[model samples]
Target: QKIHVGPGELDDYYGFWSGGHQGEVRVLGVPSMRELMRIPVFNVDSATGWGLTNESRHIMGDSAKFLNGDCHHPHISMTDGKYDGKYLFINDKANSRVARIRLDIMKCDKMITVPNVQAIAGLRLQKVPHTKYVFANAEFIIPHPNDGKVFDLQDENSYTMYNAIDAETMEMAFQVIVDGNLDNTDADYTGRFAAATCYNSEKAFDLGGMMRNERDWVVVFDIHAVEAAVKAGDFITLGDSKTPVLDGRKKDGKDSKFTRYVPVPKNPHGCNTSSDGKYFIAAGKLSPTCSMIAIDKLPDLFAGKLADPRDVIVGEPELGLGPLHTTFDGRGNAYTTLFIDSQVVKWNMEEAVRAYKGEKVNYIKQKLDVHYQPGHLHASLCETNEADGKWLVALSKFSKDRFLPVGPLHPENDQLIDISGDEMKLVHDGPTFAEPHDCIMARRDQIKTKKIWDRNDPFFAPTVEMAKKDGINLDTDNKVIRDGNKVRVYMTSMAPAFGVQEFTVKQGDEVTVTITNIDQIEDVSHGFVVVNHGVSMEISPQQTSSITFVADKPGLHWYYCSWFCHALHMEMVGRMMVEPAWSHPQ
Candidate 1:
């Protein structure tokens, strides 16, 4: 009952959750478990006009052809290994693309289609210095060029690459070709290394073929060495992409200088870094144990001072069946989600290492049963330097009996548990539609949002420039200009009416409508929607929005404000008059 948020109360943390295949990101208030906002990413949104507007269509680029997305792994930008709250990134596994959301406006500003990779399964940012590089793992192995030319998975050319993308520029920094199929990834606090779990070491296309190997491995990349290799001109370019691609796979009998392979049992899935900055944990999807690799000892192993790559491993704790992902509490406790068992197992990290050294120590602390098929478990501030260990959220895939049967499809369960005490207690069960996949939480103060948009925000700057080229000031302009078959309609909206009541154009003309919300008050967002024209957009306070569509019909078409903003919001109307194409007499 304590999870109940009253009328005027607010939650403590801001939760950024992936919208699964819906191609969006969800903003939720923690503890209260209330959805505050939904920021559209790879998906098209009608109310906000995300994919419908020219600004968003420009940001999406060629990837806009594929309107669907499978979004996963929402990670925020970091500074000095802590949350900076400037931007948040999410991966579109369905299209092999990644999108960056600006925190202030809560909108998807930039989207980059990762080259050469088929699917991005996991993504994490650099923690130590800053989020300079976003490391992403491509899950499936495909032939080079991937152009329907080669279809055999057994071919030597079939493989995936680990990508490092520049955070601020939203460009591909480099790609490292790995041997096995990649899964999840995490970067070290030192920023010198990044680790990824490789499940299909056999490069098999079928299910049973992937499980033949008794042990798979977690591949570690030396970031410094990779950069130096690129600087030394020791990388290759694939296809038409100019981004440098390096070969990191072990050839013959020797390992590459860019990466090292430490074999884990069977199929290893999720890779995570402990907040203590000392360990890299990889969960076993097929086996029952989680492999813990000591970070400090990685230098010696990379220097060839250590004989085997397995020497970096200090512990391999067997928690339970199907341990897919792990999270930390900053207090030496590690919480792992067991998919097959439907439980969360909490164990002491240091004690597990001690037990691995043949010491008689019981590292198992407690195990709490979740609803069913938990996939990802995240603790509060777990990925950052400030791990509070206050709350943990388990995203379970099945809610068969938890809620009323809606039909054939059931809602997934997002269970909130109290982790501040020694014992884990379930507090709330939130039924989410479709798949919520994964999530990350930050302190409320970590993020800073604006109440209104600035006149010169870069999000719509190009649209403003276009108006300038047309010799029109968007702030005070309510004029219509016709350039042959092209028509530009400029208008200003306040509360109850649109500045330009009617704009006339030819039926065959290409019509571009631009509206600016000159209102300075907060929460005064006006929308523009043309009847039966399939055109709509959002013009928030002090913000400008534009849309382009063909005037295909001849007659009077009514347009109105789609968002309620004032007492006479229903009366806020405008019209577009289109002359018959036959009357134009071209």
Candidate 2:
């Protein structure tokens, strides 16, 4: 892990694997298969002090309301549907948040939890085609955001939403709630058209129930028409008060300018678009078959001249037991992952597309068996619909007895496959700490990763730039500055604990706490959290971010790093005393 290989030298491309339940993303070499580093995101990183240091309290701990996340599918930045290698978007399933990582900085920069959309436990991240907007499924069919009550899934009015996010700003701009009890929008694709795969067509909220049913559907939308919905008086915006983004949502039937639910198989999972934007692939997680549709017919469907996506249907081919995800080979082949059978099934997708006039299905071209139960099969830049299949990763959920026994909690298996030839050969098997899920890869030539950050940029947020502004002394600038009714505290953050011990403030005072990750070294970030006051942030190396709170309640609160920064992570704390009004008498 300590290898000194730099960018463009170690391998032709760099692979980024999500540290699933660990709440982070791991970077590794593609061909060389070297584990480069693990940067903290939705979770705590003890070694880096992420969520441990005050500078990043808003990221993982406090501002996020002390919610932990299960990081899934990594969405790489795309340019014209190709991996642009600029930034990455990842989703937090358990906590319902979307994280954005700047590739140049190679750090999890920002995270925005879907507002009022709590615990979409199994929800995954998918994106709009060719745009900076990404969408996340509100996994369950819950009541309105204003109502917190959880009801039975069979209720007629039980609604769900698709949280649309602005990738650049890392904010959940607004939510698109269609008409129905939709399941997880497992996988998504944006291209000449847009579509989502839902397992709960009949409004079966739970996965078990969704699989129990033989019928589900795909939610297809006219990207252009959806944009018009975005411009409508009542489109998007499900928030009760903030009215953040897509306000004015009206499921005006055909006026919504989307599908009335084109039925698909039970528990259909992955959704992908071919690199050339000609074909779309969707797989069934509970069954062995996968389905495809041609993109050319989308314009007619959007215009309502054609109603169902079945009009462009290429064919549904039964490949293996559990086909969760499908990715293109950039040529003509599509690879699908079989969870139960532990194999990757490849088929001629272009041929299916060329003759997709009738409901003709495709046949398998090849099937390469893997080591364990694979869930998500990721090809190079597959999330971006750009793939050469030079390398692929079989994201296996169970390791069983593959390596040395680590008790009953088996390690997740990540098998690297060499797909440059006619057959997919298992080249390497690497066991990852925590559950590793879907990932993305970009050629070294396309990616320009760095360890440094700019201090002057407005979006820089924290770190060196504000250190001087905080005070001439970087370390002991640990003082509070009063401006009008609000005061800003400048402090330093360190691994194992915080640099400042206690913060003093008065009740009714709005306090802004700013802490910089003083660790100037690379890959050494920190996190900070103050739950009661509602503050949280993830600070990268040489970076800083602050959390603001109104000292409404008078009490001594405990503030600490939420990331497992080190052995002393639990002890990495400082005291926050919000004195009563009497204590601040004039």
Say which candidate scores most in TM-score.
1
lDDT of 1 by residue, 174-250 (tens): 99999888999999999899999999999987889899998899999999999999999999999999999999998
- Report the number of clashing residue pairs per model: 0, 40
lDDT of each: 0.92, 0.67
Worst 10 residues of 2 by lDDT: 241-250
Candidate 1 at residue 71, lDDT?
Answer: 89
Q: Evaluate model 1: give its TM-score.
A: 0.99
Displacement of the residue 156 alpha carbon in candidate 1, Å: 2.4
Candidate 1 colliding pairs, count: 0
lDDT of 2 by residue, 338-385 (tens): 988988888887555544445555556788888788888777766555
